[model samples]
Target: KKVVLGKKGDTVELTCTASQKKSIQFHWKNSNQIKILGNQGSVLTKGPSKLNDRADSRRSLWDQGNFPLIIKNLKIEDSDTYICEVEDQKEEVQLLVFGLTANSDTHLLQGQSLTLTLESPPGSSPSVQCRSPRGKNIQGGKTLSVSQLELQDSGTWTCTVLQNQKKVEFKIDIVVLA
Candidate 1:
């Protein structure tokens, strides 16, 4: 009712229920005091002054007294408070966005230190795990750091990031030479 969580590049839906007995008009507004979408019976009206047209809060879901806002390819800019006014009652819903990212490659020498950062999303505490070339489990924080790098650690270290029951793995090839 207050907070709605979503991730960038993903999909999200914001729903508003209209009145069952009386005639209700649905209006969704952004933080800029701009109309995101409006529904008037079978005829739906969308705001034409917004820059982020990526959101359709689309018109196809109307006519049944429900304004189900569907947004695809969510962007970080979409993170904000959206007001859904159904008739004379006002309801506020927020969009909390989160995403993940990682580095590309790494190279180091023996005894050198290696630190890798796995970008995490908002309100998420992602656990990171890695296996050295010797097949030993490495436990650390969001930033995976390898100390005293050796030849045994000169292979591909697969690091996994797990958050909200969702996991993503990345490979860091280490070229530790003599």
Candidate 2:
């Protein structure tokens, strides 16, 4: 069993492979049991519910042989376990899905002002850029500064720090609303 954490409104891929040749079925299940994402599997059942429909625009199964599941427009509730089950004449094997966990502190508020600060690991000058959901570089900061925020600003924000001609990246999720 494994866990993968995905952010809301993002795209993520889930992969599973059978240890041996067997009849297998793959599906996603909500392991949280918190009902935070709405009725589980209902969307898949109802002529494409909002959740599934939303994911339908982005979710895709690349290769069933490798059992790669790609989900797009990731939402907060999409955080769950996707299972890949394989059955043989005598036994069955289940592979657990792993995803990323939400780091709430990094999520910014709507119509609010905040500062994103970055410091080199040590003894280095890193070039930093702030990107938006539309894949645009909104701003650039070397050390630290205050910046205004908005609801449309919600998405994955990455910080790429280059040191010694090498690039390192740190990512944070920001959620905002008007």
Model 1 spans > 4 angstroms off: 49-52, 58-63, 105-178
How do the residues 24-88 of candidate 2 rate in per-residue lDDT, one tens digit apiece? 33343333322112112222221233345543311132123244445677654554454443333
Model 1: ten consecutive residues of lowest lDDT: 97-106
> What does candidate 1 score in Cα RMSD to the true structure?
5.9
State residue 160's C-alpha deviation in candidate 2, in Å: 8.7
What RMSD does model 2 have? 12.2
TM-score of each: 0.58, 0.37
Best by TM-score: 1
